[PDB]
Amino acid sequence: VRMNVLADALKSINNAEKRGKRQVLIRPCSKVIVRFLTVMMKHGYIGEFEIIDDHRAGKIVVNLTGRLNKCGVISPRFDVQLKDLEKWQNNLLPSRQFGFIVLTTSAGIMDHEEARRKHTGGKILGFFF
Amino acid sequence: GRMHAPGKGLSQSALPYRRSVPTWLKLTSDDVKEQIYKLAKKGLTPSQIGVILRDSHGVAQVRFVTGNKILRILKSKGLAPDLPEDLYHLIKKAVAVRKHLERNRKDKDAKFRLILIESRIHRLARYYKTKRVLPPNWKYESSTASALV
Amino acid sequence: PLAKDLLHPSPEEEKRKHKKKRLVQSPNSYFMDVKCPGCYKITTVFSHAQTVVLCVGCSTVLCQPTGGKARLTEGCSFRRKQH
Amino acid sequence: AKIVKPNGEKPDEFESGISQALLELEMNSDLKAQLRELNITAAKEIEVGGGRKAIIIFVPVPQLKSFQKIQVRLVRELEKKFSGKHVVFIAQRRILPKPTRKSKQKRPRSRTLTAVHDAILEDLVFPSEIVGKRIRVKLDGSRLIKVHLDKAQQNNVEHKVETFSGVYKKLTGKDVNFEFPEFQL
Amino acid sequence: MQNDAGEFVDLYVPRKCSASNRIIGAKDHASIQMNVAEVDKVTGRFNGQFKTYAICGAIRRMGESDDSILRLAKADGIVSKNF
RNA sequence: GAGUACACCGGAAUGAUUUGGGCGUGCCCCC
RNA sequence: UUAAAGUUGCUGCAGUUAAAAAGCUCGUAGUUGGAUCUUGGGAGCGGCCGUCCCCUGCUCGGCGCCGGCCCGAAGCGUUUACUUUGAAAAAA
């Protein structure tokens, strides 16, 4: 039984990007998935994506061009403070120049850099680079 | 897949996207509800009422001609059954299996199926208890079969 | 393969796939308007009726329950009604 | 008269004129047979894209089912009354603020913003139904809603796309396009 | 790469596949740099200029190089749109 | 009006005259 | 006795053949659980966006005006984790 729509969507998009496909459809749609894809688009990693509506659950098609090594998920949603952000990002990212970590926050679902800028923490969602 | 059998299947209904009554259907809501009341008085269950309405009367399903579902309408008028249809069917199947088992004591497969059916009955009765439709003291008992026909 | 168009698939591709695997879930069933030369009143039936139906006017048995569609009685005309 | 407002507010000249014209049309034409108590809520005038103006008419929710058999000829009569003016009949529904933990009965889903927006979108286009909705999210994060309308009864509303988009944008604030498919009908 | 001033410290910039947007390594002999010449519209003649493509070894190895080249030539304006 | 694809009419059109029917709205009969 | 031990693996180990998946199924605790309820505009600091106020109401008074209005308050606000903050936090 599907326990996490986000994990399946991330695994599917990772497989599609690794194979070399140009676009992939995700069967389950949720708001957090839309926010995370929007984070990717704002950071400039994926292209235009099309949410398709039905009366049961939406579907999402993503324009993957060339810029994803992989993009994944951490479960469960571990809670992280500001002092623990550095420890997570040293052993979670390939380097310090690029790569981002997203985490849910009451001020908005944003990356680690914006969370540090606004001086807030929350629950970690995943990473992409 | 299936809850008990190890088989995987994919066969069920597929409702259309357009949520609007078709224009060729001249039937209103009041006459559809009247037909539903007549079929309920005849002695049927909501499982077959929708089938009869979608076969003979040509209506796709109730949830578009009216707002309330079939069971909702039956509850509204008050002649809805006191016990859910699926639980009744499971109880009847369990009684049939036990009646078959009383004489033939060597049918091990029947015993296994009876155990599985009682498990299903317990799992559904727990949900009915936690959704506030049956009394908290309601219990499924092996010997109690004549009253729960 | 690599560069398809899943947003705008051709109708042939969409009809090839299963009803629940299409870009949007749409049943492949439909309703009918069956009538016979004997009686002169027209009824509405479902393709997969799965239930014996008597014409209103006690003419004859119209449909037959099978695994898929319904075996229409010989000497009957039907049209696909749609909106 | 026919126009009824929530509070004791004097309607502008446009709403009074619209109500009087509708009364005269229903008295003259053969619509008074089903248009005695069927009243109007309010009216508005806007400026849609292009050199044309649109007419917005608000509808009581319970009595909209009686209106549903009328828009076939009423819009044509209003077009005969004003050539360069498009008229659309849309329901008016109440919206409730989200129950934040600082601000009482339960808020039903019928009054939520999403349901209200869907109702407005599905009632803005009366003759042609909706086949599907495809929202495109721009690179800047802005959305672009695309709606697929029914291929049937298309040769009478294909020119109303601009006024539909203008009305929905002014009432909601979202960029909406309109397209017509042919792979099903 | 940048520094205090803004100059570049990378000793060479690598290539990049025109189809999969993947770069080409130094010891990747399967990569192909293809040159396609255009034709003047007036009569049909060779002019002297060309269009250069690049496909990584993985695409050819998996077997989708010809389709990628066809798509690139169609997008640039060589292959007829109706095709 | 129950049988058919038919016979009476009324709204309605330009003082007077009026256009083949069926209800499965698009195809089924009549010429 | 600690690191080397990614040979105790929470980060972070293995289970076809090297050590290792109960003969199979049901099942109370324990663990984990699909989608969907909130949104935009107004004015502006400025070269699309750096930055700004708005979206809990209902007996006593002072930034005050000419019986009309806000202002503060002796008195409330669905509950939890999470997150930022302040106090209280012996010395070495």
CSV table of N, CA and C in Angstrom, one decimal, chain E residues 43-71:
chain,number,residue,atom,x,y,z
E,43,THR,N,18.0,28.1,-55.2
E,43,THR,CA,18.0,27.1,-56.2
E,43,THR,C,18.3,25.7,-55.6
E,44,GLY,N,19.1,25.6,-54.5
E,44,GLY,CA,19.5,24.4,-54.0
E,44,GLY,C,21.0,24.2,-54.3
E,45,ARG,N,21.9,24.5,-53.4
E,45,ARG,CA,23.3,24.6,-53.6
E,45,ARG,C,24.0,24.5,-52.3
E,46,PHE,N,25.3,24.1,-52.3
E,46,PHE,CA,26.1,24.1,-51.1
E,46,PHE,C,26.7,25.5,-51.0
E,47,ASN,N,26.6,26.1,-49.8
E,47,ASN,CA,27.1,27.4,-49.6
E,47,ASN,C,28.4,27.5,-48.8
E,48,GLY,N,28.6,26.7,-47.8
E,48,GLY,CA,29.8,26.7,-47.1
E,48,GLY,C,29.7,26.6,-45.6
E,49,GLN,N,28.5,27.0,-45.1
E,49,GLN,CA,28.2,27.0,-43.6
E,49,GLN,C,27.6,25.6,-43.3
E,50,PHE,N,27.6,25.3,-42.0
E,50,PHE,CA,27.1,24.0,-41.5
E,50,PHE,C,26.5,24.2,-40.1
E,51,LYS,N,25.8,23.1,-39.7
E,51,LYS,CA,25.3,23.1,-38.3
E,51,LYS,C,25.8,21.8,-37.6
E,52,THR,N,26.3,22.0,-36.4
E,52,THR,CA,27.1,21.0,-35.7
E,52,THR,C,26.2,20.5,-34.6
E,53,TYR,N,26.2,19.1,-34.4
E,53,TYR,CA,25.5,18.4,-33.4
E,53,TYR,C,26.5,17.6,-32.6
E,54,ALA,N,26.0,17.2,-31.4
E,54,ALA,CA,26.8,16.3,-30.5
E,54,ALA,C,25.9,15.4,-29.7
E,55,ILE,N,26.2,14.1,-29.8
E,55,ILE,CA,25.4,13.1,-29.1
E,55,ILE,C,26.4,12.3,-28.2
E,56,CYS,N,26.0,12.1,-26.9
E,56,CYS,CA,26.8,11.4,-26.0
E,56,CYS,C,26.8,9.9,-26.3
E,57,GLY,N,27.8,9.2,-25.8
E,57,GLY,CA,27.9,7.7,-26.1
E,57,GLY,C,26.7,6.9,-25.6
E,58,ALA,N,26.1,7.3,-24.5
E,58,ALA,CA,25.1,6.5,-23.9
E,58,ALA,C,23.8,6.5,-24.8
E,59,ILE,N,23.5,7.6,-25.4
E,59,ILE,CA,22.3,7.6,-26.3
E,59,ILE,C,22.5,6.7,-27.5
E,60,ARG,N,23.7,6.7,-28.1
E,60,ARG,CA,23.9,5.8,-29.2
E,60,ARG,C,24.0,4.3,-28.8
E,61,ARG,N,24.6,4.1,-27.6
E,61,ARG,CA,24.7,2.8,-27.1
E,61,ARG,C,23.3,2.2,-26.8
E,62,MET,N,22.4,3.0,-26.2
E,62,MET,CA,21.0,2.5,-26.0
E,62,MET,C,20.2,2.4,-27.3
E,63,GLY,N,20.6,3.3,-28.3
E,63,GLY,CA,20.0,3.1,-29.6
E,63,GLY,C,19.0,4.2,-30.0
E,64,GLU,N,19.0,5.4,-29.4
E,64,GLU,CA,18.1,6.5,-29.7
E,64,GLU,C,18.8,7.7,-30.3
E,65,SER,N,19.9,7.5,-31.0
E,65,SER,CA,20.7,8.6,-31.5
E,65,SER,C,20.0,9.1,-32.8
E,66,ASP,N,19.5,8.2,-33.6
E,66,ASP,CA,18.9,8.7,-34.9
E,66,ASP,C,17.6,9.5,-34.6
E,67,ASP,N,16.8,9.1,-33.7
E,67,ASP,CA,15.6,9.9,-33.3
E,67,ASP,C,16.0,11.3,-32.8
E,68,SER,N,17.0,11.3,-31.9
E,68,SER,CA,17.5,12.6,-31.4
E,68,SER,C,18.0,13.5,-32.5
E,69,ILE,N,18.7,13.0,-33.5
E,69,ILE,CA,19.2,13.7,-34.6
E,69,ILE,C,18.1,14.2,-35.4
E,70,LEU,N,17.1,13.4,-35.7
E,70,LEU,CA,15.9,13.8,-36.4
E,70,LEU,C,15.2,14.9,-35.7
E,71,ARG,N,15.0,14.8,-34.4
E,71,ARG,CA,14.3,15.9,-33.6
E,71,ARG,C,15.1,17.2,-33.7
